[PDB]
Amino acid sequence: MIQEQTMLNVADNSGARRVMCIKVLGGSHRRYAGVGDIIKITIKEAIPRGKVKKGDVLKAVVVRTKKGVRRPDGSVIRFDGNACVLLNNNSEQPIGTRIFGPVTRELRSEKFMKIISLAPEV
Amino acid sequence: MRHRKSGRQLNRNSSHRQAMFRNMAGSLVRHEIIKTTLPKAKELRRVVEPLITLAKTDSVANRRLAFARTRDNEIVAKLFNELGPRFASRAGGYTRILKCGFRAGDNAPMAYIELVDRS
Amino acid sequence: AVQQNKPTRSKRGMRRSHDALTAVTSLSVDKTSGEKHLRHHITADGYYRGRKVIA
Amino acid sequence: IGLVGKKVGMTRIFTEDGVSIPVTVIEVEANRVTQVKDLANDGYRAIQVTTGAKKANRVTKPEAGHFAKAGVEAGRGLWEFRLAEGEEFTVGQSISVELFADVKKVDVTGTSKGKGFAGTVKRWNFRTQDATHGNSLSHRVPGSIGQNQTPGKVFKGKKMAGQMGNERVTVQSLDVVRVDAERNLLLVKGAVPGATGSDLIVKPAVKA
Amino acid sequence: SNIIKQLEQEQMKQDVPSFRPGDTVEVKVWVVEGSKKRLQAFEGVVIAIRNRGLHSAFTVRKISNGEGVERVFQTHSPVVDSISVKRRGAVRKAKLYYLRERTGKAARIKERLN
RNA sequence: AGGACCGAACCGACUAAUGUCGAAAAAUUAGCGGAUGACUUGUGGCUGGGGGUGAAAGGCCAAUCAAACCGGGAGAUAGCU
RNA sequence: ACACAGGUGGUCAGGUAGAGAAUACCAAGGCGCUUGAGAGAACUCGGGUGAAGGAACUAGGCAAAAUGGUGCCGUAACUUC
RNA sequence: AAUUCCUUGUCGGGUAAGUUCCGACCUGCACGAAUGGCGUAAUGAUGGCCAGGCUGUCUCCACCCGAGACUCAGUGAAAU
RNA sequence: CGAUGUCGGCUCAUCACAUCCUGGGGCUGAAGUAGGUCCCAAGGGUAUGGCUGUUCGCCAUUUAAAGUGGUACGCGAGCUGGGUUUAGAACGUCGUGAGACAGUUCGGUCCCUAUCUGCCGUGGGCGCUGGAGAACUGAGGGGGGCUGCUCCUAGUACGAGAGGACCGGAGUGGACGCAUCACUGGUGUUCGGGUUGUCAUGCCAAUGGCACUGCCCGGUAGCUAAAUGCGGAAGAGAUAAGUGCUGAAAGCAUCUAAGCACGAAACUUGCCCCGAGAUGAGUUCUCCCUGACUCCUUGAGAGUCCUGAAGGAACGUUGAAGACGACGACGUUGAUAGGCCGGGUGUGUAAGCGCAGCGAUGCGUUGAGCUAACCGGUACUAAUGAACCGUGAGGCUUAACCU
Ligand SMILES: [K+]
Ligand SMILES: [K+]
Ligand SMILES: [Mg+2]
Ligand SMILES: [Mg+2]
Ligand SMILES: [Mg+2]
Ligand SMILES: [Mg+2]
Ligand SMILES: [Mg+2]
Ligand SMILES: [Mg+2]
Ligand SMILES: [Mg+2]
Ligand SMILES: [Mg+2]
Ligand SMILES: [Mg+2]
Ligand SMILES: [Mg+2]
Ligand SMILES: [Mg+2]
Ligand SMILES: [Mg+2]
Ligand SMILES: [Mg+2]
Ligand SMILES: [Mg+2]
Ligand SMILES: [Mg+2]
Ligand SMILES: [Mg+2]
Ligand SMILES: [Mg+2]
Ligand SMILES: [Mg+2]
Ligand SMILES: [Mg+2]
Ligand SMILES: [Mg+2]
Ligand SMILES: [Mg+2]
Ligand SMILES: [Mg+2]
Ligand SMILES: [Mg+2]
Ligand SMILES: [Mg+2]
Ligand SMILES: [Mg+2]
Ligand SMILES: [Mg+2]
Ligand SMILES: [Mg+2]
Ligand SMILES: [Mg+2]
Ligand SMILES: [Mg+2]
Ligand SMILES: [Mg+2]
Ligand SMILES: [Mg+2]
Ligand SMILES: [Mg+2]
Ligand SMILES: [Mg+2]
Ligand SMILES: [Mg+2]
Ligand SMILES: [Mg+2]
Ligand SMILES: [Mg+2]
Ligand SMILES: [Mg+2]
Ligand SMILES: [Mg+2]
Ligand SMILES: [Mg+2]
Ligand SMILES: [Mg+2]
Ligand SMILES: [Mg+2]
Ligand SMILES: [Mg+2]
Ligand SMILES: [Mg+2]
Ligand SMILES: [Mg+2]
Ligand SMILES: [Mg+2]
Ligand SMILES: [Mg+2]
Ligand SMILES: [Mg+2]
Ligand SMILES: [Mg+2]
Ligand SMILES: [Mg+2]
Ligand SMILES: [Mg+2]
Ligand SMILES: [Mg+2]
Ligand SMILES: [Mg+2]
Ligand SMILES: [Mg+2]
Ligand SMILES: [Mg+2]
Ligand SMILES: [Mg+2]
Ligand SMILES: [Mg+2]
Ligand SMILES: [Mg+2]
Ligand SMILES: [Mg+2]
Ligand SMILES: [Mg+2]
Ligand SMILES: [Mg+2]
Ligand SMILES: [Mg+2]
Ligand SMILES: [Mg+2]
Ligand SMILES: [Mg+2]
Ligand SMILES: [Mg+2]
Ligand SMILES: [Mg+2]
Ligand SMILES: [Mg+2]
Ligand SMILES: [Mg+2]
Ligand SMILES: [Mg+2]
Ligand SMILES: [Mg+2]
Ligand SMILES: [Mg+2]
Ligand SMILES: [Mg+2]
Ligand SMILES: [Mg+2]
Ligand SMILES: [Mg+2]
Ligand SMILES: [Mg+2]
Ligand SMILES: [Mg+2]
Ligand SMILES: [Mg+2]
Ligand SMILES: [Mg+2]
Ligand SMILES: [Mg+2]
Ligand SMILES: [Mg+2]
Ligand SMILES: [Mg+2]
Ligand SMILES: [Mg+2]
Ligand SMILES: [Mg+2]
Ligand SMILES: [Mg+2]
Ligand SMILES: [Mg+2]
Ligand SMILES: [Mg+2]
Ligand SMILES: [Mg+2]
Ligand SMILES: [Mg+2]
Ligand SMILES: [Mg+2]
Ligand SMILES: [Mg+2]
Ligand SMILES: [Mg+2]
Ligand SMILES: [Mg+2]
Ligand SMILES: [Mg+2]
Ligand SMILES: [Mg+2]
Ligand SMILES: [Mg+2]
Ligand SMILES: [Mg+2]
Ligand SMILES: [Mg+2]
Ligand SMILES: [Mg+2]
Ligand SMILES: [Mg+2]
Ligand SMILES: [Mg+2]
Ligand SMILES: [Mg+2]
Ligand SMILES: [Mg+2]
Ligand SMILES: [Mg+2]
Ligand SMILES: [Mg+2]
Ligand SMILES: [Mg+2]
Ligand SMILES: [Mg+2]
Ligand SMILES: [Mg+2]
Ligand SMILES: [Mg+2]
Ligand SMILES: [Mg+2]
Ligand SMILES: [Mg+2]
Ligand SMILES: [Mg+2]
Ligand SMILES: [Mg+2]
Ligand SMILES: [Mg+2]
Ligand SMILES: [Mg+2]
Ligand SMILES: [Mg+2]
Ligand SMILES: [Mg+2]
Ligand SMILES: [Mg+2]
Ligand SMILES: [Mg+2]
Ligand SMILES: [Mg+2]
Ligand SMILES: [Mg+2]
Ligand SMILES: [Mg+2]
Ligand SMILES: [Mg+2]
Ligand SMILES: [Mg+2]
Ligand SMILES: [Mg+2]
Ligand SMILES: [Mg+2]
Ligand SMILES: [Mg+2]
Ligand SMILES: [Mg+2]
Ligand SMILES: [Mg+2]
Ligand SMILES: [Mg+2]
Ligand SMILES: [Mg+2]
Ligand SMILES: [Mg+2]
Ligand SMILES: [Mg+2]
Ligand SMILES: [Mg+2]
Ligand SMILES: [Mg+2]
Description:
This is part of a larger assembly, with chains A, B, C, D and E.
Chain A: E1 7-10, E2 16-24, E3 38-46, E4 58-64, E5 69-71, E6 75-79, E7 83-86, H1 113-118
Parallel strand pairs in A: 1-7
Antiparallel strand pairs in A: 1-2, 2-3, 3-4, 4-7, 5-6
Chain B: H1 14-31, E1 33-37, H2 38-54, H3 60-68, H4 73-81, H5 83-86, E2 95-103, E3 108-115
Chain E: H1 2-11, E1 23-31, E2 38-40, E3 43-50, E4 57-62, E5 69-74, E6 80-88
Antiparallel strand pairs in E: 1-2, 1-3, 1-6, 3-4, 4-5
Bound molecules: potassium ion (2 copies) and magnesium ion (MG) (133 copies).
The structure holds 4 RNA strands.
Region (Disordered) (chain C): 1-37
GO molecular function (chain C): structural constituent of ribosome
Family (chain C): Belongs to the bacterial ribosomal protein bL32 family.
């Protein structure tokens, strides 16, 4: 259940280590994002060499949440770390060529099929 | 709002509430009859009747439970010896409630509570 | 907080109409002793439903 | 038309493919038609029905007679349903739950669970005032209730504190899962008003 | 009541293996990818069990690639194919939510062998 | 050794809430500062009203202070209500 | 002004834990605070716990939460050393 | 600038965004040398700002435990 | 002026239309996409942040949109007190000085238990014309009315290309609302366990008290949101702007003067709730009551005895009902509460005894013991025979027809 000011570990290998959520897109007065929703990200801590330098506003997709995701069978998947993959604002599609950690089924929706191919599990 | 919710509070904090019943059990088991307020007496059924049923199976652990509750060897001695065998055929309803007017000093509905025997 | 100007005898009457407490009008009669008492309460001597259950 | 039925809690149905759907269990015993109100006598066409059972002593002569006119057992409570012009029913006729075997979506109507005297925060979803930051004796209070000397009054239908629940409400277009004939059940999806044991006027969904 | 208990006790499968908490358990799960019907596996420690008949469930924790993944299965769902127990651990609590904080060496648990 | 350090008694009174016809004409609860010194406290003295005293605020001088209180001039005076 | 949650100097100093006249639980001894009895709505007051987030609150992190002991390793700028 | 009006001066730093803050510039309406000027370690229930940690402060309120509120009996005010 | 508390924020709103979005239209320098302006339209909806006391503004990022106003520049007997206006202090400037300055700076008590109106709830009284119990009808009143993105038609019309639809159909989101606890969680001082200090039960063991529930770990029922369902409608009637069709006065022409047809989230219904005190007190159904007598201002007169039904109240046991009333269930011809019994759940292998080990401790009987609000049975306890209220065919004037 990610929202404004929430800090996320980054799943991809783009360059960012910690990224702060600044806004949840897709509808006015929208409180939270989860599962595989789009958020607006600012980068608060980067690695030295990376593709994306510090203090750069860009979009991202949530991949894991501590509160977790429900499936049709009344069954939940909780993680131990809120996390996201970075994206290229108007272009979309991820920056990082490799993705760390698992991702949900409910992320599978055409535009993120690149993430699931590169991701290791689920 | 207390839907399905059991247990009278009696304008007392838990630790106190739990003690006064522990006293009133010891009061009731020894004398075999009490006057108290009608609510207090109604809630006193849920403490005393278990101790009477626990006293049917005369074992050690049951003595140690009947002593964990109550907290008196005398009362434990009046249980098990008398009230264990005296309430055997009777399967429940060991105590009886009888309303006895109003407590003069504060108009509180009084009630006799006593064990079903008196003989 | 505070009244603008005082109420009357009438209003004060109107309000008190409901304060009139009801009587019992429902006295029992104990089967054996024939003494009067509140329903489901014991008698002052010491009876309830024709059986002595008090010292 | 519609059937009266007692609510018997909620469970769920695991559909063979995977999905677990939450269902309310409504026991719907044979609704016996007592009185057929007609345009000739009353000025509107309708039927009066009943279900369950009372004791032959708790029921009052006024109603014990009322049933004896029809020639049925004294069911607990009485309800009334409107006919749909072309329909026509007879007195002393049982209505089983097999009416809903055809239809898919239904309206359930029952009395909600009483919350008693609820505040504005609970009843009307008023926002609670600042829990600290100087605040004095006004966290969950409603704040202002009007303007000033212009209206000089509080307008009607103001959202204030008072009674919440214990009022009749309809939940609309719930999907029926199963319609059991043997034990007289009806398994509607989702949650319906009133606690276990409360009565429910179930009827076919109006919004077709 | 009888009316619910008739409907619940019907749907419950009559072939569940009796597992305790702190047991390492591989749970085979059905997944659908349009027309396909795949069996996933999901090995992990059973952190907690919840018994309510048809509504029963259990939480399994795994520490897969990267971070921890706590998954909650509805025991009597058709999606859970089989619950194969591996090691059964001697813990003396019902819920093992203290395994959220511990990782690696602290997270490992004694075996029963009873 | 120290107008040293932390910290009870004791002395103070920074924040907050409570109370605001109060439990109380300045307090309570939770924290807060000093705590061998320019410390604090008991007892008894001295300083008196244009006077005292004041690490100075016009602070304090008996719940009263940019001039106390009680009595007297005195029924001050009031183009005002 | 009251049988008023406030003010009032000196003396005596038990036990177990503790650095201690802190604190906890007890002794000797003394009290249960002079309206009670019910119910267990909003709301107020003093508290407890809280998913996911973690100052986005607000004039301001006010208030809460947090840190907290003892022994040892280690401890930067700057410095009147 | 505890001094700056014009003003949120301009440039830089910090922030996704900074009328506050830190550094610099001089155009000092109206600093300035014992009514002291500029530095300054240590000290502050001191003023401003930022970063960790921690949190019901907040998103967004939920439940719970006590004291009142509510009913019964006794006593019984007040401002107006 | 014998006091009408002045900015801003919070909470709570409400109205206007000079409309920001959504809706309907004309003209376009309208090919389509998107616009531009004007007309009709007030049903609903209408940011979160950074800076500053701010209103405003600027900036960042969203949105379908981030409307303009009124309401004592709405709302301090609803909250705040950052700002402005008390007393302290300082800077700059002005003044010989006391002091002064919409100049700046640091600090600075926000009182009130609601009589009346109003409002949200909730009863009692009488009425509704013989009394009682039900179930309706519906005058009237209230709630609700937001909307994105994604496909299909279709890469079709349009367009040299780039780009790219109208009109209809489907799915899935946000915000808001209603319900609910099966799921996911929270809570759970009334259940189980671990544990620190210390007292107590003679002591060991085992328990209990107290330390915020001493600290913690799980947690049943309930309540509940972050959890899961459902909702806004489609449809008709009458319309606005607008569009028209026949058609004179005006041998033509014109949407109109007669006549006739379309035409919007507005209006009236449809959906939901309250609702016959709707005194205009409506209806249908059922139930209950059919005895004498003097007195006489012979009056819808008043009493005397005889009769008191339907029903109701009270009292009790009580409830997923509830501040109190009220509302529902039950009162022995009885499952209303408590108990008990059997589960279920929860916690996690009790106590004692035996063996292992020097001891802490371990192991076996043992998934044991203990289990609140849960489910199903069982009259063991408590719901009393009666007394209380409530009566004895129901006025008159007209009218339609059986003796
Ligand atoms: K004179
Ligand atoms: K044992
Ligand atoms: Mg109960
Ligand atoms: Mg009391
Ligand atoms: Mg205690
Ligand atoms: Mg036993
Ligand atoms: Mg047993
Ligand atoms: Mg015990
Ligand atoms: Mg007046
Ligand atoms: Mg008067
Ligand atoms: Mg009057
Ligand atoms: Mg209720
Ligand atoms: Mg708020
Ligand atoms: Mg204050
Ligand atoms: Mg407060
Ligand atoms: Mg208040
Ligand atoms: Mg107030
Ligand atoms: Mg010192
Ligand atoms: Mg300290
Ligand atoms: Mg002082
Ligand atoms: Mg008060
Ligand atoms: Mg302390
Ligand atoms: Mg101190
Ligand atoms: Mg200190
Ligand atoms: Mg110091
Ligand atoms: Mg002296
Ligand atoms: Mg002298
Ligand atoms: Mg001095
Ligand atoms: Mg001065
Ligand atoms: Mg003064
Ligand atoms: Mg003078
Ligand atoms: Mg003077
Ligand atoms: Mg004079
Ligand atoms: Mg003069
Ligand atoms: Mg006293
Ligand atoms: Mg006192
Ligand atoms: Mg001792
Ligand atoms: Mg001591
Ligand atoms: Mg002490
Ligand atoms: Mg002793
Ligand atoms: Mg002694
Ligand atoms: Mg003693
Ligand atoms: Mg004494
Ligand atoms: Mg004394
Ligand atoms: Mg007292
Ligand atoms: Mg309470
Ligand atoms: Mg509270
Ligand atoms: Mg806390
Ligand atoms: Mg805790
Ligand atoms: Mg917490
Ligand atoms: Mg939290
Ligand atoms: Mg927890
Ligand atoms: Mg947490
Ligand atoms: Mg802020
Ligand atoms: Mg804000
Ligand atoms: Mg300050
Ligand atoms: Mg603080
Ligand atoms: Mg808190
Ligand atoms: Mg905490
Ligand atoms: Mg604290
Ligand atoms: Mg704590
Ligand atoms: Mg050591
Ligand atoms: Mg930056
Ligand atoms: Mg700048
Ligand atoms: Mg500067
Ligand atoms: Mg400079
Ligand atoms: Mg130059
Ligand atoms: Mg100069
Ligand atoms: Mg100077
Ligand atoms: Mg200077
Ligand atoms: Mg000089
Ligand atoms: Mg000088
Ligand atoms: Mg000089
Ligand atoms: Mg200087
Ligand atoms: Mg200097
Ligand atoms: Mg200096
Ligand atoms: Mg310095
Ligand atoms: Mg310096
Ligand atoms: Mg200081
Ligand atoms: Mg400031
Ligand atoms: Mg900041
Ligand atoms: Mg911080
Ligand atoms: Mg009273
Ligand atoms: Mg008086
Ligand atoms: Mg006046
Ligand atoms: Mg204002
Ligand atoms: Mg208009
Ligand atoms: Mg409409
Ligand atoms: Mg803004
Ligand atoms: Mg005003
Ligand atoms: Mg104006
Ligand atoms: Mg104003
Ligand atoms: Mg105001
Ligand atoms: Mg006002
Ligand atoms: Mg101020
Ligand atoms: Mg302040
Ligand atoms: Mg201030
Ligand atoms: Mg100021
Ligand atoms: Mg201050
Ligand atoms: Mg106030
Ligand atoms: Mg309407
Ligand atoms: Mg729409
Ligand atoms: Mg739980
Ligand atoms: Mg707990
Ligand atoms: Mg316990
Ligand atoms: Mg117990
Ligand atoms: Mg343990
Ligand atoms: Mg001892
Ligand atoms: Mg001893
Ligand atoms: Mg020992
Ligand atoms: Mg003790
Ligand atoms: Mg104590
Ligand atoms: Mg204590
Ligand atoms: Mg404490
Ligand atoms: Mg205590
Ligand atoms: Mg605490
Ligand atoms: Mg605790
Ligand atoms: Mg306990
Ligand atoms: Mg304990
Ligand atoms: Mg601690
Ligand atoms: Mg603690
Ligand atoms: Mg013509
Ligand atoms: Mg619409
Ligand atoms: Mg029972
Ligand atoms: Mg069995
Ligand atoms: Mg069993
Ligand atoms: Mg179990
Ligand atoms: Mg064992
Ligand atoms: Mg134990
Ligand atoms: Mg043993
Ligand atoms: Mg053992
Ligand atoms: Mg039990
Ligand atoms: Mg118990
Ligand atoms: Mg039970
Ligand atoms: Mg039962």
